[PDB]
Amino acid sequence: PQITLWKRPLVTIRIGGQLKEALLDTGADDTVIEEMNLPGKWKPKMIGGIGGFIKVRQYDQIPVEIAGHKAIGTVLVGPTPVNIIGRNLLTQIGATLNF
Amino acid sequence: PQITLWKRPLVTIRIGGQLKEALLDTGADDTVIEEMNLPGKWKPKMIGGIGGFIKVRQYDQIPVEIAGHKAIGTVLVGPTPVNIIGRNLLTQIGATLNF
Ligand SMILES: CCC(=O)N[C@H](C(=O)N[C@@H](Cc1ccc(O)cc1)[C@H](O)CN[C@H]1Cc2ccc(cc2)OCCCNC(=O)[C@H]([C@@H](C)CC)NC1=O)C(C)C
């Protein structure tokens, strides 16, 4: 899909067998998902953004379906205002910026 | 051009007669430039991201050239670790996400 940026690039994703809305964020190194139960072990981690640093749970090798496209990587779960798909998963689905 | 997301999508922009490196951010509603003495009237405002909110100065109709592409719009100036080109300006240069 070719997505324009007139509106926030929000798409539906499936993670942990559940559907969620997520922002395709090219300015994000990592993928940060709102607090939820994800099967598997997790390690505590700190990531920074605008405003500062927050504490997140780091889940590795998690399968995530982005608009029907598969990706398996690291997902950080924490207190985020919106579900964010970062470059770590965007590169897996072959996402590019064009202009 | 086509920009892959293997590394952060950093490009050269021209603002206030200066050349800066900025991040193409589809997850940003606004454009945020690192602290600089831009002339003109401004309006105080608060923008939020991952770790919280930061106070910034809102400058309207600021000319900003992005990778040789001309644009003009609202620019926020404040304590940011990196220059962020948001959707407000990305749409003007015809930028899209493709996968
Ligand atoms: C440092 C590693 C890194 O890349 N961190 C990421 C990050 O915050 N990236 C921001 C840019 C940045 C890069 C390197 C660095 O060292 C510090 C900051 C990027 O700007 C985040 N993109 C969005 C995400 C978001 C979207 C909506 C939100 C909150 C967050 O609430 C809606 C409210 C509206 N907020 C926004 O539109 C902001 C603008 C203002 C940021 C400039 N957007 C972002 O922060 C997080 C998301 C893993």
Ligand 1 pocket, mutate which of A25, A46, A80, A90 (most atoms under 8 A from CB): A25
> Is B38 exposed, middle or buried, given 0-12, 13-18 or 19+ CB atoms closer than 10 A?
middle
Distance, CA of A55 to CA of B25 (rounded, Å): 23
Which of A71, A99, B47 is closest to A86 using CA atoms? A71
The DSSP code sequence of B14-47 is: EETTEEEEEEE-TT-SS-EEES----S--EEEEE
The token pair at A96 is 């590019």
Q: CB count, 10 Å around CB of A13? A: 23
Is there an atom of ligand 1 within 6 Å of B25 CB? yes
Final resolution, Å: 2.0
Distance, CA of A48 to CA of A51 (rounded, Å): 8
Please name each of the domains of chain B with its CATH number. 1-99 (2.40.70.10)
Q: Which helix (H) or strand (E) holds B90?
A: helix B87-90
- Whether B10 has its CB under 8 Å from any CB of chain A: the answer is no
Q: Where are the alpha helices (DSSP H) in A1-99?
A: 87-90
Is there an atom of ligand 1 within 6 Å of A60 CB? no
Which of B36, B56, B34 is closest to B47 using CA atoms? B56
Half-sphere exposure of A21 (CA within 13 A, CB side): 5
Q: Is residue A98 a contact partner of residue B96, using CB atoms and an 8 Å limit?
A: yes
- Whether B90 has its CB under 8 Å from any CB of chain A: the answer is yes
The token pair at A59 is 């889940």
Q: What's the Cα-to-Cα distance from B50 to each of A52, A58, B27, B96, rounded to whole Å?
A: 7, 16, 11, 24
